[PDB]
């Protein structure tokens, strides 16, 4: 219940990873998407979801 909420959790090592992960995502969201178009002609299950 209430004692089991997130605010009672440490998760700091995972939180630091999320901080690094979010920073990496912003700096590579566009870069990865362009590579998908450059290499994968047609979208297929298992490929990067691109476009709309």
């Amino acid at each position: 219940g209430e004692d089991a909420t997130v605010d009672k959790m440490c998760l700091e090592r995972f939180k630091v990873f999320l901080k690094q992960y979010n920073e990496w995502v912003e700096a590579n969201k566009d870069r990865l998407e362009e590579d998908s178009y450059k290499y994968d002609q047609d979208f297929y299950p298992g490929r990067r979801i691109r476009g709309k």
């Binding site: 994968d40 002609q41 047609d42 297929y44």
Partner: protein
């Protein structure tokens, strides 16, 4: 009575009071030549340089731009008369034997040459040029234009223009400053009397150099043409040559999006009217895109579509000749337009009458020479009924 005057004051009048004889007259304006395919592009797999007997192999396996090549406006006039219509040719020829021969060629074809002027001090189909070595490359400059490219605006036959319900010209005249000025006067007169303007592009060799440059030259004549005929290569070149080539070369990586794509047939792509918007204008009553005699993509303000055709140059391998096929399909269009005014606003009858143009083009590919083997109306009508099921004719 002044051809060079502005077509806004008193007409040429004269004593025409009785009704004109059917079918409606058609004016074909520009140079007069025999053969002389204008559309020239660079093609791969050339045959033997000297052994011309092998060159038939490129007639039944032609370059995609030369599938139904056009010609001079004289071919359209000659082919139109053999289809039953009446055509008058406007142009200038020299006083030499060739000018007499060319006029004799059109006279024997029942083409009204009353609009043909004679330049005594000129040599027919003869352009005097000066060779100059500029930047290490040999070039030439037109010192004196030929009589074909030397028709003054004061030499126009207003009697032809008033009667002519359709005015036909090519983009070859746009390569001559003299004829380009004369053309706009003739178009202005023709619009005054109510005739329709037909623009068969047939882009000559210089006009294939650049898309932007060509569209600027065509811009003025394109905007005043009620009917325009272009080939697939011409239309793609005007819009984007590389874009439509990439679509043809595109193959889905994993699977086809429909069963028909698996067959990997020839790409008979029908351009959407949105892709035609850059080239469309208010006065354009009809635009036809001809993939040879295979597809006739027609476009009207109200509707658009494609008419499926065929080609069988292989049925007579030794007498097949693509030359003049584009003239035959154009002449077939004008033959029916002058007789079926409902075509511009009835899609069903538009397809049926365009099949006549398809059949005319097919026959024109079965004989060596353009004017030598332009089909007769009965020959064209018979092929249309044989090729198509009776529901399509």
């Amino acid at each position: 009575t002044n051809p060079d005057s502005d077509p806004a004051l008193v007409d040429y009048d004269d004593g025409i009071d009785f009704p004109y004889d059917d079918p409606p007259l058609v004016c074909c304006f520009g140079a007069v030549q025999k053969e002389f395919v204008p559309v020239v592009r660079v093609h791969d797999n050339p045959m033997h340089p000297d052994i011309y007997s092998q060159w038939k192999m490129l007639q039944w396996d032609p370059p995609e731009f030369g599938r139904a090549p056009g010609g001079p406006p004289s071919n359209v006039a000659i082919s139109h008369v053999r289809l039953g219509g009446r055509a008058a040719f406007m142009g200038k020829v020299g006083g030499d034997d060739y000018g007499e021969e060319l006029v004799l060629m059109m006279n024997k074809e029942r083409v009204q040459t009353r609009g043909v002027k004679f330049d005594e001090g000129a040599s027919t189909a003869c352009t005097r040029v000066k060779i100059k070595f500029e930047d290490g490359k040999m070039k030439a400059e037109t010192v004196k234009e030929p009589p074909e490219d030397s028709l003054l605006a004061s030499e126009l036959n207003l009697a032809v223009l008033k009667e002519a319900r359709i005015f036909h010209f090519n983009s070859e005249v746009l390569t001559s400053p003299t004829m380009e000025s004369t053309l706009f006067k003739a178009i202005q007169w023709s619009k005054k009397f109510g005739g329709l303007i037909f623009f068969d592009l047939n882009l000559p060799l210089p006009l294939w150099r650049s898309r932007n440059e060509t569209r600027k030259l065509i811009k003025k004549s394109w905007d005043e043409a009620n009917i325009i005929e272009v080939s697939q290569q011409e239309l793609e070149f005007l819009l984007d040559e590389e874009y439509y080539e990439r679509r043809r070369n595109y193959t889905p990586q994993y699977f086809a999006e429909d069963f028909e794509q698996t067959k990997n047939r020839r790409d008979y792509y029908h351009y959407t009217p949105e892709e035609i918007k850059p080239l469309w204008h208010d006065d354009l009553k009809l635009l036809v895109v001809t993939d040879g005699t295979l597809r006739l993509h027609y476009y009207t303000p109200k509707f658009d579509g494609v008419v499926v055709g065929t080609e069988d140059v292989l049925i007579t391998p030794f007498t097949c000749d693509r030359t003049g096929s584009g003239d035959a399909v154009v002449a077939g269009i004008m033959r029916k337009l002058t007789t079926c005014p409902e075509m511009f606003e009835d899609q069903d009858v538009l397809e049926r009458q365009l099949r006549f143009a398809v059949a005319a083009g097919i026959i024109s590919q079965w004989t060596i020479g353009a004017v030598r083997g332009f089909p007769t109306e009965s020959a064209t009508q018979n092929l249309k009924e044989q090729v198509y099921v009776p529901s399509m004719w």
